[PDB]
Amino acid sequence: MLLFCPGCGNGLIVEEGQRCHRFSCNTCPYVHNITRKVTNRKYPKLKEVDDVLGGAAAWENVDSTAESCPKCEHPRAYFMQLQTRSADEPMTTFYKCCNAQCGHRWRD
Amino acid sequence: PGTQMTLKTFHFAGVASMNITLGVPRIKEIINASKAISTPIITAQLDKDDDADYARLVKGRIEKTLLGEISEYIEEVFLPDDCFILVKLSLERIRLLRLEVNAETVRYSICTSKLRVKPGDVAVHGEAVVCVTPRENSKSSMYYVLQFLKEDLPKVVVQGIPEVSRAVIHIDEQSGKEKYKLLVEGDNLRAVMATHGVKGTRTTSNNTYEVEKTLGIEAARTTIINEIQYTMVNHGMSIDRRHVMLLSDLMTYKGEVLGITRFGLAKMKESVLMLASFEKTADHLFDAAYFGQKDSVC
Amino acid sequence: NEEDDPVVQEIDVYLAKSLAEKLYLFQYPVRPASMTYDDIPHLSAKIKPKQQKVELEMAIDTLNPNYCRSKGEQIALNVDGSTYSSKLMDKQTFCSSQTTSNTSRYAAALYRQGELHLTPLHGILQLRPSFSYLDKADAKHREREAARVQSYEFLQKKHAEEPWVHLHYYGLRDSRSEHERQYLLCPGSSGVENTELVKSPSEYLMMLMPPS
Amino acid sequence: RRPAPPLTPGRLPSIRSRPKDVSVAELLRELSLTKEEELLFLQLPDTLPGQNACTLADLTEGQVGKLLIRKSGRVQLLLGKVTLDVTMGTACSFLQELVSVGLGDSRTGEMTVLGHVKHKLVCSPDFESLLDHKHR
Amino acid sequence: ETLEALILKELSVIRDHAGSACLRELDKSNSPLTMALCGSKGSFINISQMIACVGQQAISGSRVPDGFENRSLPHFEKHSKLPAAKGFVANSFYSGLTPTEFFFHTMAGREGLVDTAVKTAETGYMQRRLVKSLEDLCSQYDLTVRSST
Amino acid sequence: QEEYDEEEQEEENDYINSYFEDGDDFEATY
Amino acid sequence: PIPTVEEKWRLLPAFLKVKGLVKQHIDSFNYFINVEIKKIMKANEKVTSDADPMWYLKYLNIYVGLPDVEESFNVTRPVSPHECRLRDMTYSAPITVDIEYTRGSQRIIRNALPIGRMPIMLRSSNCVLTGKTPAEFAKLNECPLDPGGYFIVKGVEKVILIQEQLSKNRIIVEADRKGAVGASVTSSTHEKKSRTNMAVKQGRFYLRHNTLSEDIPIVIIFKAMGVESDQEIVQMIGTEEHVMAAFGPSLEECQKAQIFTQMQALKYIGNKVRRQKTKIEEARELLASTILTHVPVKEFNFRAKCIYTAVMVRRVILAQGDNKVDDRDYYGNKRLELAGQLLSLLFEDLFKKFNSEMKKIADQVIPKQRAAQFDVVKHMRQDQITNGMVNAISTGNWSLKRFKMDRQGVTQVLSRLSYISALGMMTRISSQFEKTRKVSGPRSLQPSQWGMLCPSDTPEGEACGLVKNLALMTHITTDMEDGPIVKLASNLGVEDVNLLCGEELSYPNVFLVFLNGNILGVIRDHKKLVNTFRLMRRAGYINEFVSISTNLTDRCVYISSDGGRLCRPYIIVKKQKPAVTNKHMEELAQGYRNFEDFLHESLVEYLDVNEENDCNIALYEHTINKDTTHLEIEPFTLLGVCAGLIPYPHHNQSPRNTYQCAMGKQAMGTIGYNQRNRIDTLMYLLAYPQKPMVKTKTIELIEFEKLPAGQNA
Amino acid sequence: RMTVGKLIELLAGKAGVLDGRFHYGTAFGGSKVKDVCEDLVRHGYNYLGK
Ligand SMILES: [Zn+2]
Ligand SMILES: [Zn+2]
């Protein structure tokens, strides 16, 4: 931790003495006798367990619609909207995702 | 295509919170063929794709785990005798993470650390408690190196690869089958692909320079075409296969993967007149008269 | 506001300027409030009221159970190369600084049995332990082993023009201390005098905030 | 072993081996219940109303103050007509003592220690009531 | 972040439902519907935005950021995580936009104006870097492509 | 390979010039 | 149902009658030729020679007369603006000063000495075109609808664009490629601008400055400033376990180096610094009033500087390790600059140059003299000042070597294409940022600006946000003093910084006071402080243009009183209800109880961008809640001048709104009442202008129905 | 272009030129499409625009 001297006001660093170590400083004569036990306990931040990302569980969060996809004739599919600048004028595009045994991703 | 390629994050959703650049930056980095790549993502497949417990076991294998995050608590004890630092290894957090690091493993990782330490005053007391006594020599007192070893104990890696930073497992579903794919975010593929968990046969990378260093120059012309086509289908556009096949073979015929920069163009072409517009005031112009090379007008 | 009239405490306030002239408040930001400096024997005290500069010189026990005589000998050789009148370090010097020369608001208050006394303060100084004995020491050691604008030297000459005053120390229990306490305590006028200052609040706020 | 290494975060407790706010009214009630004698340091509003400026130096001696303690309220000082309120601010945690310096002719000097102060009060004018009285 | 996406899809469901209910009430002679069916100039999203509701005005694929003190605009409350407060527009173009909704709609108007105004510089850099690289690659008469050398 | 910037190193060409019309109203030849 | 008052729409015309749209450009000049012209005069008043201390110059008073022209000989007649616009002359008036010079042995006081000329605004107080009548405006061949505000130099109309810059005397904490970094820019009343920055790397703080060669630890600067004990340093830094663990490396580095006394610290600073008188003296003068000029020192006390640096270190400590950074796109800190301050700097530099020039011409004629009397009037010229002013206005390249600054493209030709383009040019504001493609934040619409800059009004093309226009309700605060403010602050009960120690500032209840980037002191119960300050401001003692806010994250109150701030009038609410009633607006409709009387009766008040951050504002009256503090007068005031010509702006889309705002200044139409008399380079006229059927209230506010630029079809 | 204010502008202009008074079209207010549609009937024309 941070410990200062009461006389001068500077900091102290532990050094070796004659028989045992002592708290001394290089600014003014001041020695403190080391006693039975002084101890500082710290609690470093531990790490947690990581989660598995991806899967249909997270895909159920986003809501889907009813539009057929011409790959396997399956009506269930996810639709999203996006803004894109075309060559002539602004144009809103839709991203299509097939929620089936094939699972394709299209952009029309 | 690049003209209409100036939009923001396209497939942005809470499902996958993964920062991967896709658009004109990715195409620009591919054309420049720089060594340092941004947002590295590298995918691998497992041998056991049915059990997820094996996937969780091998996930902790390829991952840089530190000592301070696993250590329960560290404390400096002071007594009439010589002081030392004491760290309490928690076995429950190791059992929850399914790690194969024991007290001797921590001792071997500490003795093989970068800061000044040799196996003279580093011991294990019981099961998962380690005591380290700092020496008094060769730089200053032991008090100053005590504050220096306490802030690098967490920095000392106990297991994994220092290159890889973060890893997550992805779940693929089908008609009836389930698959688990391990994607990590690092650069040194030679170390992750040569692992017991992930199958080294089925593994794809994103760094063209690293994949031509590990696999080869002929295998780098295929991964540079797949990344370009993966960026063009994300925009709703369509290019021909040989259009990019000819561009991938243009920086693969002479030597290694050469980038389209000011330095690589001087390695590709050998005409000073065309470089006169790229470079600056008089450097090349005077070095040409100094050396005296013949420019071919072709 | 009907619950403010029943419970009303009466408190009288007095003012005395007998000891307001010769009074200085000392501040010690280095020392915790638990411990005190009046029990430690002091050698001497020195003052200049012109620039309001005080210096205190205290003495600690030279050979006590908690003292490093080894480093003391080294410090003695360093200072010798006469500030100290002994063979080791046994004195401590505390210097001051001028702080807010314009002292009109700050005044001390004494709370006796039932009357309060107000004494205006002259000046407030901050005493801090400075160490200037090693600077000159190492300077002398190094020089021995080797061999119109208003600037700072102007203010140093201004400080050096005036002579210096020395005083003695008096502590916790002394007849002089009780005499000073009673002189600043007893107001003398025990009569009930009123109407000493008349000022309406509408005029007091105008005196506070000048329209011009 | 009286001198112990002090701490900066724990200067007041300074245990190392073996903050609460107090109202002015509660503080004075506690000081009067035990019947002690301790010095107080207070700051007063500048340009005190009088008969240019009027401080405590250019004044007379006697009783010119009146303190009022309103129930479930605050502590209000008064000099007949003007109204002020006193509060506690910047709670002292270090050592503060006041001494009396004595000047002789040239060299003879007497410096006597009076006591220590561990409480700082601030007196302020309430402009709200003054403005209400002026406008009305 | 988990809550930011849970309510982001609840605001899109009402918009999609309104857009789908508007199609069943529209006539088969409306010029906008005819142009949307033919596909000349328009889309169904524009029809649902002009009739039913605008939707959600997102900026850089995110919600409107705070700008004074943990709040987007000073007219709202502190730490107000409400849909209509942050960035949700409810009234359509026909009814009339709220000044707070008009400001949020104008915020998205300029983000799309600055990414095409500067795109010419990057596109020109890339075009000059690509053209000067490939200017002599041609096919010979023996079905072989070679360089100038 | 030095960490340079494309803008300051590569000088602006006709590619960079964005031909766009704005209202901005108000050599020896032989 | 709630009691609604549909009468607050007539407050906006009454507010625009006194100031607003284009009158502030003239108030910036009228306050300049009445205060700042005298400020620079009292700045440089006495000049003395070096040959013999007997000759000296003095200035009594200076003023500017009326626009005059000097013809063939000894004929001064009043000139008209149209006369100068037709003869390609320059609208200027002479400057009459009272000088005093001691020639020979006696002293001479020559009154009414002309020293030069100076341009005058078209609608200023000294010009002729003021307080006239339309019948008299038609006699001088001048359009009465002309808003004015431009300069006439060589028969062209030049307008000085308002330019926005960052605030000085403040601490910024930004993030760069390495981490977090703090910076402080200072610029005092005299010519010295500095920019210091504290950087953090591997847990070691360093201070960088323009005159310093290498980085120096902050603890070294602390020990050099005057604080000797290292405990007081950490005490001033912060009393917390996590701020002390991050200050350990600095402490051990200061202990490693053999630096324990102030003299050794100053010697180290002198060895480190390089300047092209010993090292201690230069190191001491370098720390006194060189790095931080906005913090004055009484004699040699670095206590306030130590406190400021400690607050800066605590700020950079609390910033590092968190996800909080300060951005420059915030408009609460960004200040505006009109044509007044630029002219102030130019005139100050020209006056100093003229005082230093004649001092050098009369120093080598006194020793080598042939007479006994030397007159300074014969050795004087008045052409340099006029030529310099005219060239600086025409070319528009502000070059000041005394300030070490160079700016181009400040003055622009007033576009006379239409009546909207001419007025819209006066509301145009340009930024100091160059044509950078990489920057997008400042160009993007910021949530900070609300009713101060029109969002729709912006040019389409390269400049997509660098050029902005003001709103209908907008006022720029002028310069004022701080004497009464600091006096009332000290009377409220604010404690001085020299009394308390370093451990008190870390206390949560303790609050610091900031005034124009200066630590006033420590105060408790900041809520009552702010309440009493706002009450005193509403009273009328303190000026109305004083901003006061509070920050709980930083735990400090900010008091802003410098000139160049943004404020718009807001209606006050009283806990459920607006103070403005129907009986107060009936009197305004009658002809009494104007905006001044409303401001004097505590009915409305101005708020800043940072002041409205700490208050709740309601759009309408049905939305007024118990937490609202102020009420919007009119919600249609957010749109700009060019955006007020679009029918149903909320119905239209923002790109179309911007397109129409850009094309409104492009449409041709009637210019004014005298278009056949004026002879400009290129002019467009219409044949039969019609009147818009669906007009807007903003159209009537500017009277656009008298000069329309379109036709109904 | 997605401009609905043009049709309302045309409608209000027609109603004004028929009635004989200028209609206000200020932002965040002005006139609605309900009181103007019923006024276009008194004359004899169609109610919205046809
Ligand atoms: Zn010590
Ligand atoms: Zn499918």
Side-chain angles (χ1 to χ4, degrees), chain D residues 57-96 98:
Chain D
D58 45 344
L59 205 62
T60 79
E61 300 81 20
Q63 164 194 320
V64 300
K66 191 172 186 180
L67 267 298
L68 291 194
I69 304 168
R70 307 297 178 91
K71 176 171 46 57
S72 64
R74 75 278 191 190
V75 294
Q76 163 181 148
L77 189 148
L78 183 134
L79 283 76
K81 290 181 173 67
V82 307
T83 295
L84 304 172
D85 44 27
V86 293
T87 45
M88 275 187 67
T90 74
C92 202
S93 88
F94 50 89
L95 191 151
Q96 255 185 307
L98 61 95

Side-chain angles (χ1 to χ4, degrees), chain A residues 69 71-72 98 102-104:
Chain A
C69 72
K71 182 63 72 176
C72 318
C98 179
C102 203
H104 293 293

Side-chain angles (χ1 to χ4, degrees), chain G residues 40 53 80 97 149 155 229 245 292 348 388 409 462 467 569 602 610 646 675 685:
Chain G
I40 313 177
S80 158
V97 72
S229 312
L292 308 182
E348 171 265 356
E462 296 61 31
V467 181
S602 87
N610 54 2
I646 308 169
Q675 44 195 357
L685 279 83

Side-chain angles (χ1 to χ4, degrees), chain C residues 96-153:
Chain C
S96 49
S97 278
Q98 180 44 284
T99 286
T100 76
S101 57
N102 184 87
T103 80
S104 315
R105 315 163 166 96
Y106 313 105
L110 191 146
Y111 183 72
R112 197 181 177 183
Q113 311 183 35
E115 67 272 15
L116 279 69
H117 303 106
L118 295 199
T119 301
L121 268 175
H122 190 107
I124 301 181
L125 315 177
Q126 293 187 332
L127 278 83
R128 296 176 186 175
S130 87
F131 46 101
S132 44
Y133 48 86
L134 59 87
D135 214 8
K136 63 94 177 179
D138 66 28
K140 185 92 170 191
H141 206 69
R142 294 308 305 121
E143 69 94 13
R144 176 173 43 261
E145 308 303 327
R148 292 181 179 92
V149 300
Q150 281 194 320
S151 162
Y152 162 89
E153 302 177 359

Side-chain angles (χ1 to χ4, degrees), chain G residues 422-434:
Chain G
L423 183 66
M425 194 87 177
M426 311 299 304
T427 52
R428 277 208 204 178
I429 293 183
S430 63
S431 159
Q432 61 90 30
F433 288 102
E434 67 278 351

Side-chain angles (χ1 to χ4, degrees), chain C residues 3-4 7-15 17 19 22-33 35-38 47 104-113 118 120-121 124 164-171 176-177 180-181 184 189 193 196-199 201-202 204-205 208, chain D residues 2-3 6 11 31-32 35-51 55-57 59-72 79 81-82 93-96 98-103 106-107 109-116 127 130 133-134:
Chain C
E3 60 96 24
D4 293 348
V7 173
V8 161
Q9 307 272 47
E10 176 67 14
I11 294 296
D12 298 312
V13 190
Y14 295 93
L15 174 149
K17 297 184 290 293
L19 273 298
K22 292 189 287 184
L23 194 66
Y24 277 104
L25 175 88
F26 285 167
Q27 181 174 357
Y28 293 93
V30 180
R31 187 74 159 182
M35 322 196 73
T36 321
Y37 283 164
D38 64 354
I47 195 175
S104 315
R105 315 163 166 96
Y106 313 105
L110 191 146
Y111 183 72
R112 197 181 177 183
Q113 311 183 35
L118 295 199
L121 268 175
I124 301 181
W164 208 277
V165 187
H166 302 266
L167 277 73
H168 312 80
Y169 180 75
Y170 300 105
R176 189 165 293 160
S177 77
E180 302 295 328
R181 269 182 172 178
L184 63 88
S189 87
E193 61 157 18
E196 305 294 325
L197 55 93
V198 291
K199 265 295 184 178
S202 75
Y204 171 58
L205 64 90
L208 272 178
Chain D
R2 298 151 178 162
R11 165 194 267 180
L31 177 60
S32 87
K35 189 63 177 64
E36 297 313 317
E37 295 174 348
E38 198 267 331
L39 280 152
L40 277 193
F41 174 67
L42 57 93
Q43 176 176 354
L44 57 92
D46 196 61
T47 77
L48 191 150
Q51 287 71 239
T55 80
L56 300 195
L59 205 62
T60 79
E61 300 81 20
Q63 164 194 320
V64 300
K66 191 172 186 180
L67 267 298
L68 291 194
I69 304 168
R70 307 297 178 91
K71 176 171 46 57
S72 64
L79 283 76
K81 290 181 173 67
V82 307
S93 88
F94 50 89
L95 191 151
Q96 255 185 307
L98 61 95
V99 289
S100 158
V101 55
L103 275 301
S106 87
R107 285 292 89 72
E110 302 86 3
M111 200 273 312
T112 312
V113 176
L114 278 301
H116 300 251
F127 298 91
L130 263 62
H133 170 62
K134 178 182 181 177

Side-chain angles (χ1 to χ4, degrees), chain G residues 20-31:
Chain G
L21 181 64
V22 75
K23 296 181 176 67
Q24 61 182 357
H25 299 87
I26 322 173
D27 308 301
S28 159
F29 189 83
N30 278 318
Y31 156 80

